[PDB]
Amino acid sequence: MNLMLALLTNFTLATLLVIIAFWLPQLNVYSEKTSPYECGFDPMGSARLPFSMKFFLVAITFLLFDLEIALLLPLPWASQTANLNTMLTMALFLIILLAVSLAYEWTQKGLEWTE
Amino acid sequence: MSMVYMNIMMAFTVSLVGLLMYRSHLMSSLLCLEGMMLSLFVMAALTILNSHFTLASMMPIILLVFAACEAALGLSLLVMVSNTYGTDYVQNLNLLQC
Amino acid sequence: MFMINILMLIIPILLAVAFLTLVERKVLGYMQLRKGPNVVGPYGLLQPIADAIKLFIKEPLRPATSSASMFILAPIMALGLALTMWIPLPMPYPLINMNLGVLFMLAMSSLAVYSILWSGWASNSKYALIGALRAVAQTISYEVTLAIILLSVLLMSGSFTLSTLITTQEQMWLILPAWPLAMMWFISTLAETNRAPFDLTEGESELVSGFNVEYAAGPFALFFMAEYANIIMMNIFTAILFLGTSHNPHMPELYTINFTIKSLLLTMSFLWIRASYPRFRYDQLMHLLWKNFLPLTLALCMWHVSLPILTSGIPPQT
Amino acid sequence: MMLYIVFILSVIFVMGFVGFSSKPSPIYGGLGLIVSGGVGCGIVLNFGGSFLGLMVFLIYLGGMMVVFGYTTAMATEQYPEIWLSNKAVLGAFVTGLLMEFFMVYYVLKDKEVEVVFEFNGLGDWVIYDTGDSGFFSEEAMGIAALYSYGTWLVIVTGWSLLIGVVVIMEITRG
Amino acid sequence: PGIVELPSLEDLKVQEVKVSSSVLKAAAHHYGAQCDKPNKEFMLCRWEEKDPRRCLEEGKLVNQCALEFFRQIKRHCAEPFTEYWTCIDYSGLQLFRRCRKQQAQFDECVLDKLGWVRPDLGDLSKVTKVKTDRPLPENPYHSRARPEPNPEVEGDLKPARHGSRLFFWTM
Amino acid sequence: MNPIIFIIILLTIMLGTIIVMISSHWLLVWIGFEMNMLAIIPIMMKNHNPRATEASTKYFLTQSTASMLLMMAVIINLMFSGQWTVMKLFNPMASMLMTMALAMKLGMAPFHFWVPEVTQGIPLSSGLILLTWQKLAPMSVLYQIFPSINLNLILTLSVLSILIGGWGGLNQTQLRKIMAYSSIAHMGWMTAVLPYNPTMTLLNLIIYIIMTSTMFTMFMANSTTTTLSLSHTWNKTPIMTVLILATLLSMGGLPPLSGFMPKWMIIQEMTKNNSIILPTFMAITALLNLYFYMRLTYSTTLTMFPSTNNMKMKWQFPLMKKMTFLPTMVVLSTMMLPLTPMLSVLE
Amino acid sequence: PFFDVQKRLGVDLDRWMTIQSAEQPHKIPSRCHAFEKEWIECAHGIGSIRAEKECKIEFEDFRECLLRQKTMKRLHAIRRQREKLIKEGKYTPPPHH
Amino acid sequence: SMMKWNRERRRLQIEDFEARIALMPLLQAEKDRRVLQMLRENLEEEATVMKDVPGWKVGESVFHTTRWVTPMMGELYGLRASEEVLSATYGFIWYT
Amino acid sequence: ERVAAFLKNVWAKEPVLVASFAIAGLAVILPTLSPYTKYSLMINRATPYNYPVPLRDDGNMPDVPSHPQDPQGPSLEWLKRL
Numbered sequence A: 001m002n003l004m005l006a007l008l009t010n011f012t013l014a015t016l017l018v019i020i021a022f023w024l025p026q027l028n029v030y031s032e033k034t035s036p037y038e039c040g041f042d043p044m045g046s047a048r049l050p051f052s053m054k055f056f057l058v059a060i061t062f063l064l065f066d067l068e069i070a071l072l073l074p075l076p077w078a079s080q081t082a083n084l085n086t087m088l089t090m091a092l093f094l095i096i097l098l099a100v101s102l103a104y105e106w107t108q109k110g111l112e113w114t115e
Numbered sequence B: 001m002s003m004v005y006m007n008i009m010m011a012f013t014v015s016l017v018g019l020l021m022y023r024s025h026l027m028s029s030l031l032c033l034e035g036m037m038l039s040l041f042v043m044a045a046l047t048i049l050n051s052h053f054t055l056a057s058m059m060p061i062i063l064l065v066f067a068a069c070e071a072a073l074g075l076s077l078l079v080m081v082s083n084t085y086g087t088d089y090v091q092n093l094n095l096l097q098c
Numbered sequence C: 001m002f003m004i005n006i007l008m009l010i011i012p013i014l015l016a017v018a019f020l021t022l023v024e025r026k027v028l029g030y031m032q033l034r035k036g037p038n039v040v041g042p043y044g045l046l047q048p049i050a051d052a053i054k055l056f057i058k059e060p061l062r063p064a065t066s067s068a069s070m071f072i073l074a075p076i077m078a079l080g081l082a083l084t085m086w087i088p089l090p091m092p093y094p095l096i097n098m099n100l101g102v103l104f105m106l107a108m109s110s111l112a113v114y115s116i117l118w119s120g121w122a123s124n125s126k127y128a129l130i131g132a133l134r135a136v137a138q139t140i141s142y143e144v145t146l147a148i149i150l151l152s153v154l155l156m157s158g159s160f161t162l163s164t165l166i167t168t169q170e171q172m173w174l175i176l177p178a179w180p181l182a183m184m185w186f187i188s189t190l191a192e193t194n195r196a197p198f199d200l201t202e203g204e205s206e207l208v209s210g211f212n213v214e215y216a217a218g219p220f221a222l223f224f225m226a227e228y229a230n231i232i233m234m235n236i237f238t239a240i241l242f243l244g245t246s247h248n249p250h251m252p253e254l255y256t257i258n259f260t261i262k263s264l265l266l267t268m269s270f271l272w273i274r275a276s277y278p279r280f281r282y283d284q285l286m287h288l289l290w291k292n293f294l295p296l297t298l299a300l301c302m303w304h305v306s307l308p309i310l311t312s313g314i315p316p317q318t
Numbered sequence D: 001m002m003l004y005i006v007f008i009l010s011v012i013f014v015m016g017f018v019g020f021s022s023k024p025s026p027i028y029g030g031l032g033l034i035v036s037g038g039v040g041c042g043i044v045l046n047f048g049g050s051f052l053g054l055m056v057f058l059i060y061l062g063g064m065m066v067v068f069g070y071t072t073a074m075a076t077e078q079y080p081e082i083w084l085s086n087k088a089v090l091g092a093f094v095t096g097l098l099m100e101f102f103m104v105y106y107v108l109k110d111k112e113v114e115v116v117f118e119f120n121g122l123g124d125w126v127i128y129d130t131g132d133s134g135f136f137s138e139e140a141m142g143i144a145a146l147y148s149y150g151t152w153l154v155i156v157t158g159w160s161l162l163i164g165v166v167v168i169m170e171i172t173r174g
Numbered sequence E: 001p002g003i004v005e006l007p008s009l010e011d012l013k014v015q016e017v018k019v020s021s022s023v024l025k026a027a028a029h030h031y032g033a034q035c036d037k038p039n040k041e042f043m044l045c046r047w048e049e050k051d052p053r054r055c056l057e058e059g060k061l062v063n064q065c066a067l068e069f070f071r072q073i074k075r076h077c078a079e080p081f082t083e084y085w086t087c088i089d090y091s092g093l094q095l096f097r098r099c100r101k102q103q104a105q106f107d108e109c110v111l112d113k114l115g116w117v118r119p120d121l122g123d124l125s126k127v128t129k130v131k132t133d134r135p136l137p138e139n140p141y142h143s144r145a146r147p148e149p150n151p152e153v154e155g156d157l158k159p160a161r162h163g164s165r166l167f168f169w170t171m
Numbered sequence F: 001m002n003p004i005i006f007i008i009i010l011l012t013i014m015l016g017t018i019i020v021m022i023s024s025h026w027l028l029v030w031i032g033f034e035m036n037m038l039a040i041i042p043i044m045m046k047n048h049n050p051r052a053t054e055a056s057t058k059y060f061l062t063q064s065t066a067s068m069l070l071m072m073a074v075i076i077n078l079m080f081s082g083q084w085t086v087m088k089l090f091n092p093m094a095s096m097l098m099t100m101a102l103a104m105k106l107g108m109a110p111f112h113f114w115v116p117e118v119t120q121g122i123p124l125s126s127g128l129i130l131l132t133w134q135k136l137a138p139m140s141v142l143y144q145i146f147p148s149i150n151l152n153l154i155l156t157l158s159v160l161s162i163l164i165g166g167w168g169g170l171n172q173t174q175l176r177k178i179m180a181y182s183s184i185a186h187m188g189w190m191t192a193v194l195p196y197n198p199t200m201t202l203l204n205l206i207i208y209i210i211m212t213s214t215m216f217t218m219f220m221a222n223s224t225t226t227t228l229s230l231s232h233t234w235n236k237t238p239i240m241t242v243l244i245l246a247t248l249l250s251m252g253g254l255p256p257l258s259g260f261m262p263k264w265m266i267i268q269e270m271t272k273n274n275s276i277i278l279p280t281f282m283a284i285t286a287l288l289n290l291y292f293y294m295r296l297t298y299s300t301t302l303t304m305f306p307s308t309n310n311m312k313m314k315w316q317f318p319l320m321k322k323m324t325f326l327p328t329m330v331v332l333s334t335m336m337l338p339l340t341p342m343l344s345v346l347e
Numbered sequence G: 001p002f003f004d005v006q007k008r009l010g011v012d013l014d015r016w017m018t019i020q021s022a023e024q025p026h027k028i029p030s031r032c033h034a035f036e037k038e039w040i041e042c043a044h045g046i047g048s049i050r051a052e053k054e055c056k057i058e059f060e061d062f063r064e065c066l067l068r069q070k071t072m073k074r075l076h077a078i079r080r081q082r083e084k085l086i087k088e089g090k091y092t093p094p095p096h097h
Numbered sequence H: 001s002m003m004k005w006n007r008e009r010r011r012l013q014i015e016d017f018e019a020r021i022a023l024m025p026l027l028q029a030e031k032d033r034r035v036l037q038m039l040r041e042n043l044e045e046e047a048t049v050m051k052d053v054p055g056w057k058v059g060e061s062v063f064h065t066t067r068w069v070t071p072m073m074g075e076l077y078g079l080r081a082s083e084e085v086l087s088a089t090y091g092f093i094w095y096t
Numbered sequence I: 001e002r003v004a005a006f007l008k009n010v011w012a013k014e015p016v017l018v019a020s021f022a023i024a025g026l027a028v029i030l031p032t033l034s035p036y037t038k039y040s041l042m043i044n045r046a047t048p049y050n051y052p053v054p055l056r057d058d059g060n061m062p063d064v065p066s067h068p069q070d071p072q073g074p075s076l077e078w079l080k081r082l
C-alpha cells in the first residue's frame, strides 16, 4: 500500500501542476503562435519523415548486452553458494564471452557509425 | 484455474492474433512477437512462483535472453528490408511468389 | 502518518530543486568572474520564487502539429518519476524499504528516458526530434556500463538493498577499494542526468533547446524540475554507494547532517564540471563508454567477483 | 477491493496487449507494451517474484527504447496512426476491449466464468501458500542456482548471445 | 474421499508463551541450550511424522519447557534481562551487535545464578541425535501398494529363427 | 563471410539440432530450436540480395511464430503436470499447440506456404540444409511425443501435405521450387506412419535425406537452378544426367530402387493396423510426384534439348566443385532395396 | 531424449530441473513435493500405458495439488451458500471469522 | 579492510541465524496449533452454512490420499474478514 | 625481447586496454593461487539457513552429539580465528 500511495501522490502532484499551468494563465492562441519552430522560417518537410540512424548496429548490440546484465545481476546471490568452484568458473566464463563479443564487434568495425 | 490465468492466457491469444493479422509495418508485427513472449514470461513465472518450484525460477530469465536474441534478429532483418525498399512494409516482400 | 511522511519528502525536494537553480547560477557566476543573481531578494534568495511564479502564469502553448495527449503526458511522467526515485533512499531510513532498491532505481531511471523520447516526438518539430534521438543514443551509451558498475560494487555489499550499503561502509568508505568504479560511476551519472559535458539532448548551442524546444511556461518547468531533481538524487545515490555515512541508531540526525553535506558537495561538483569543460559530440560519448569504460568495467566486474572469493571476504546475504 | 489486486493489474495487462496488438503506429504500440510490461512486473511481484518482475520491466524498457529509435528511422509515415485514426485499428481495439470487458463482467458476477475453459473467480489469493518463515527469498535462491546447477544453461545461453552478435553483424553487412 | 480428522478445540489448548520476538531473540541462545531435549524431540517428530496432528503432545512439552525456562529468568535475572531485550527491541533489525554491553550483564547474571553457559558460535546449528520412545512411522506418506513390475525377460539370446522373416528375405 | 565465421555458424546450426535431440527438458528443447534458427538466418542471407532478404524474413517470421506456440505448449504442460520432461504431454490443448508448432517448423500443409518461397530465395547449398538437416530436430520431437498426439490432426496434416506437395510441384519450372514441393509431399509420408510405427518415420526420413542430398549436390555441381538450365547437362557431363535419372526415378518410389523402400514399409505398417483406405490414397497421390519427376528426366536425360554455341567453351574445363560424398550418396539413393531388412538397425 | 547421450556419458545436462521433487537449493521443497513423489514412484518402470490406469489415483491427487480445481469448487460452493443465508437472514458469522 | 569487515559480518550472520534455529521449534509448535485451530473453526461454521444442502458432507477431502496436506490460503482464511485475508496473503510483499 | 616491445607499444597507444587485460588476468589467476580461497566455501557451508533436523538416536552414533554443547560435531574455532 505504501508504495502505491507514494506513486499515486507523486503523479497526482505532477498532474495538478499541469492543470494549474494550463487553466491559470491568460491565453491568446492564433495560427502563427502555434506554428512549428525552426529558427524563424517555416519547416521544409514534415518532422515525421524518416530520420536515419547511424548507430543502428550498436543499438541492436545493446539489446544483446542489456540481457547479459540480467544474467549477471544474480551474481551477489550466487556467491553465497557452497559450490564456489563451479560458480566462479561460470561467472568468469559468461563475462569473458561478453568481452569476446565486444572485441569481435570492435575489431569488425561494428562500433563505427555509418557515414 | 485461478482467475489470473484467464487474463494472461487472453493476453497471449490477443498477441497471437495480432501477430497473425498483419497490417503494413513490419515493426508492428515484431512488437506483437515481443508481446507474446511477455505473456509467456508472466504465465510461466506465476506457475513457478506459486508452486515453489525453486530451481525453475531461473527459467523465466532464460526465456528473456532468447527473446532478445529473437528481437535483435528481427530488427536486423528489418534494417535490410528497409534498406532495400525504403519502408518496412510487408507488401514489398512479394518477389518470391515467382 | 505515512501521507505526512510523503509530503515531508516531496515538498522539500522541490524547494531544494528551486534553490539549486539559484546556487548553480551563483556558482557559475563566481567561476565566471561575476556574481549571479543578487538583486531579487537578499543575495538573490527570492530569484527561484520569481522564476517559478513567472513560468506558471506564462501562457502554455500546444503546438499546432503536436500529438496532444503525449505532449501533456511526457512532462507529467518526467516529474512524477523524478520524485519516485527518492522513496527508497535511506537518509538513513528509506520512505519505502525495498529488498531490491538498486534494481528499482535502475528500472525507474530507464522509464524516465521515455519522458524525453515522447516529449520530443510529440512536439512534431525537427529540433525536438533530433533531441529525442540523442537521448536514445545517450541511453545506449551509458546504460549497460552503469548497471555493471553497480554490480561490481554490490559484490562487496552483498545485497541490492540500499540500507545495506550503510552497513557495508561502517568501517571505511567504498571509495577506497573501488575508486576506479567511482570514477566511471561519476561520469555515468553525468551522462544519465544529461549534464555537461553530456548535455546533448538539449544541446542549446546546437539544437536551440532540443527535446523541449516547443515547451513553454508550466510544462517546461516540469522538465526543469525533473532534471534538477535527478541531479540531486543521483548524487545522494553516489554518496550512499561510495561515501557511506556512519549511522548511530540513537542519533539518526547526525547521519542526516553528514550525509547531506556529502550529497551537497557532490552536487556542487556537477556545477563545477559544467563551468569547466566543452561539450562532447554525441557519437564521441558513445565511443567513450563502449571503448573505454565497458572494457574496464567488464574487467573490474571479473575482478570483484573473484576478489571476495580469493580473499575469503564474501559479504553476508542478509 | 485490494484482495483483487492481481486481477486488476491483469486487466490492464490485457488492455496494453490490445493496445499494441491492434497495431497503430509502432510509437504507440511501444507505449502499450511498456504499460503491459509495467503491470506485468506488478503481477509477478505480487506472487513473490520481486526480482523477476523488476527484471522483465527493465529488459522491456531497454528493448522499447531501441524500437523507438528504429521506428523514427524505419517505421514512420507522414501521419502516424493512433487508435482512433484508422478504421481497422479502431475495430480491433474496440473488439479487444469488449471481449475483455465481458469476461471481467461475468467472472465477477458469478465468481466463475466459462471462456472456452473454466476459470474460478474467487480471487487470486486463495491459491497462495500459507506457511512461510525462511530467512531468504526462494526466488533469489532459485535464480542464483543458475551458476551452480545451470552450468549447461549458462553455456548454451552464453554461446547463443555471442553467436547473436556475430550473426547480426553478418545479416546487416550488405 | 474421506473426512479430514481434526483435533477438537479442547485438544489444541496450551498455555502460550506470550512474549515478543525481541524477548525471544534476546533469550534465544540460552533457550537453545536449556530446552534442547523437548525441542529436538518435537522436531524429530514433525519431520518423521509429516503431520501436525501427530505431534501435538510433543508440541505442548515444547511450550511447557519454554514457560519453565522463562520463569527461571524471571525469578533470578529479571532486571538484567529486561535491559537486554529492551536494547534489542529498539533496533529495526533486532541486531545483537548493538547490545553487547547489556548482553554481557545478562550473560554473567544467568551464569552466576543458574550456571547457564552461552553456546559457542556453531553450537546451535549442529545436527544432534535424540533418543525417543515413539515408534518410527511405517507409511508416513500413506502410500498405496506399488504396481508390480513388468515380468522380466531373461534367457539366452539365440539367433532369430529363420532370420528377419521380412517377406522373401532368407537372412 | 569469413571462412572461420562460416564454420562457426554451421557448427551452431548443428549444435542447436543436437541439443534438441539429446535434451530431456522442454526448456532445452526450445533453446535448441532458438539456437538453430539464429544460426541459419545468416546462411540464408549469405549472398545479400532482395530475394535472400525476403526469404530470410519470411523464414524468421514463421519459425519465430512456431517457437511461441511451442513454448505455450510447454508452459500449459507444466501447469497440468508440474514437470518438464520431454515425453508425452499431459494436456490435449498443449498437444495440439505443440503439434501445430512442429508442423509449421517442418512446413507441412497448410502451413507449407513458406517452404517453396524460402527455398527459391536462398542458394542451393543453403537450400540443401533447409530441406534436410532442418527436418531432424522437429521430427525427433514428434518421435517422442506421438503417444499423446491427436490421430485425426496428424493424419489430416499428412494427407494435406501429400496432396498439396504433389499438386504444387506440377506447375513449377524452378528446381528449388520443385524440391520444395517434393519435400512437402515426403513430409506427409513420415507423419502418416508416425502414430503406428515411429521406426518407419525414421527410415523414410533417412532415405529422404540421402536422395534429397544427392539431387542438391548434382544441381550444385552444375550450378543449375532451372529446368532449362539443367537441360544443357547432357552436353557438358553426360554421366550426371544418368545419375539424375536414377535418383529421380528413386524419389518416385519405383522398384527396384531405394526410394520404393519407405513407401513399401509404410504401407505394411498401415495395413497391419487395418488402415487400408489411407495407404491406397497415399500411394495413388504420390503418382503426382512421379509425374513431375518424370518431366525432369525427359528434359534432362531421355531427350536432348537445344544447346547454345557458347556451351562449347565449357567442354574444355573440368568440374571443380567439391561434390562431397556424391558417389556414395547416389549409390545409396538407388541400390539399397536388397538390404531392406537392415531397417532393424533403426529399431 | 531422442539420443540419450546423457545416460551413455553419465553427465547431467538438464534432468536436474525436470521435476520439482529433485534436489533444490537449501532443500527448499515445492508445494506439491509429496504428491509428485508418490506419482513418480508409483509409475516408475512400468511404462506410460500401464501408469495411465494403475497410477490414476496418485496422478489425480497430484493434479489436485497443482491446480486446486476441486478445492476452489468446494470453497466457491460454501461461499455461495453463505451469501444465500446472509440475504435471507438465516445465518450470522461468528466473531472470530 | 573490506575482507576483515566482511568476515566479521559473516560471523554475525551465523549468530543471528542460530538464534532463529533455537526458536524454530517453539514457533513450529505454535504454528501447528494455530493452523489446526483455524481449520477446526472453519469446519464448525461449514456445518451450519451447509446443513440444508442435499448432498453435502461436511469436512470432506478432495484428495484420495489420507495423508496430511498443507492448506492453501483460501482453505485456511476462507471465511474471514478481508482485513485478515489481505494481511495474510499480501502483508509481507506490501510491507514497505 | 618482443615481450617488452609489444607491451610498451600498447601502453603508449591504448593504456585502457592494457589495464583491462591485466585486471582480467588477475581475476582468472589469483583465485587458484590464494591460500584463503578454501575458506570461502567453508564459510558458505557453515551458514545455517535451514534447521538442523535431529537424527533418531539408534544406539550407535558416537560421532554425533546429544546436545549442541557436546564435543562432537563440527566446530567453528577456525572461523573465530579468521
Ligand SMILES: CCCCCCCCCCCCCCCCCC(=O)OC[C@H](COP(=O)(O)OCCN)OC(=O)CCCCCCCCCCCCCCCCC
Binding pocket: F237, F238, F239, F240, F241, F242, F243, F245, F246, F249, F256, F257, F301, F302, F330, F331, F334, F335, F336, F337, F338
Ligand atoms: C543392383 C540391385 C538394385 C537394382 C537397382 C538399380 C541399380 C542401378 C542403379 C544405377 C545407379 C546410377 C549409375 C548408372 C551408371 C550409368 C553409366 C553410364 O550411363 O555410362 C556413362 C555415360 C556417361 O558418358 P561419359 O562419362 O562422358 O562416357 C563417354 C560417353 N560420352 O553415360 C552416357 O553417356 C549416356 C548418355 C545418354 C543417356 C542415356 C540414358 C539412358 C540409359 C540409362 C541407363 C541407366 C538407367 C538407370 C536407372 C535404373 C535402371 C534399373
Ligand SMILES: CCCCCCCCCCCCCCCCCC(=O)OC[C@H](COP(=O)(O)OCCN)OC(=O)CCCCCCCCCCCCCCCCC
Binding pocket: E168, E169, E170, E171, F256, F337, F338, F339
Ligand atoms: C541385387 C541382385 C539382383 C539384381 C536385380 C534386382 C532385383 C530386385 C532387387 C530388390 C530386392 C530383391 C532381392 C531378392 C533377394 C533377397 C533375398 C535373398 O537373397 O536372401 C537373403 C540373401 C542371402 O541369400 P541366400 O538365399 O542365403 O543364398 C546364399 C548364396 N551364397 O542375403 C541378401 O539379402 C543379400 C543378397 C542380395 C542380392 C545381391 C547380392 C548377392 C551377392 C553378389 C554381390 C556381388 C559380388 C561380386 C562383386 C563383383 C565386383 C565387381
Ligand SMILES: CCCCCCCCCCCCO[C@@H]1O[C@H](CO)[C@@H](O[C@H]2O[C@H](CO)[C@@H](O)[C@H](O)[C@H]2O)[C@H](O)[C@H]1O
Binding pocket: A084, A085, A086, A088, A089, A092, A093, A096, A097, C309, I028, I031, I032, I033, I037, I038, I039, I040, I041, I042
Ligand atoms: C571463452 C571461455 C573462457 C573460459 C574461462 C574460464 C576461466 C575459469 C578460471 C578458474 C576459475 C575458478 O578457479 C578455481 O576456483 C576454485 C574455487 O572458486 C578454487 O578452489 C579453491 O577454493 C575452493 C573453495 O572456494 C576449494 O574447494 C578448493 O579446494 C580450493 O582449491 C580453485 O583453486 C580455482 O582454480
Ligand SMILES: CCCCCCCCCCCCO[C@@H]1O[C@H](CO)[C@@H](O[C@H]2O[C@H](CO)[C@@H](O)[C@H](O)[C@H]2O)[C@H](O)[C@H]1O
Binding pocket: A095, A096, A099, A100, A102, A103, A106, A107, A108, A109, C291, C295, C296, C298, C299, C302, I014, I017, I020, I021, I024
Ligand atoms: C575481460 C574483459 C577485459 C578485456 C578487454 C575486452 C575488450 C577488448 C576490446 C577489443 C580489443 C581488440 O580490438 C580492437 O581492435 C581495433 C581495431 O580496429 C582497435 O581500434 C583501433 O581503432 C579504434 C578507433 O580508431 C581505436 O580503438 C584505436 O585507435 C585503435 O586501436 C583497438 O585498439 C582494439 O582494442
Ligand SMILES: CCCCCCCCCCCCO[C@@H]1O[C@H](CO)[C@@H](O[C@H]2O[C@H](CO)[C@@H](O)[C@H](O)[C@H]2O)[C@H](O)[C@H]1O
Binding pocket: B009, B013, B016, D117, D118, F076, F091, F092, F093, F097
Ligand atoms: C492457438 C490457440 C491460442 C490460444 C491458446 C489458449 C491456451 C489456453 C490453455 C488452457 C488449457 C485448459 O485445458 C483444459 O482444462 C480442462 C480443465 O477443466 C480439462 O477438462 C477436462 O479434463 C479434466 C480432467 O482431465 C476435467 O476437467 C474433465 O475431465 C474435463 O473437463 C481439459 O481436458 C483441458 O484441455
Ligand SMILES: CCCCCCCCCCCCO[C@@H]1O[C@H](CO)[C@@H](O[C@H]2O[C@H](CO)[C@@H](O)[C@H](O)[C@H]2O)[C@H](O)[C@H]1O
Binding pocket: D001, D002, D004, D007, D008, D011, D012, D104, D108
Ligand atoms: C484504464 C481502465 C482500467 C480498467 C480496470 C478494470 C479493473 C477491473 C475491476 C475489478 C473490480 C473488482 O471488484 C471487487 O469485487 C468483489 C466481489 O466480491 C468485491 O468484494 C466484495 O466481497 C464481499 C463479499 O462477501 C462483499 O461483502 C464486499 O462488500 C465486497 O467488497 C470488491 O469490493 C470489489 O472491489
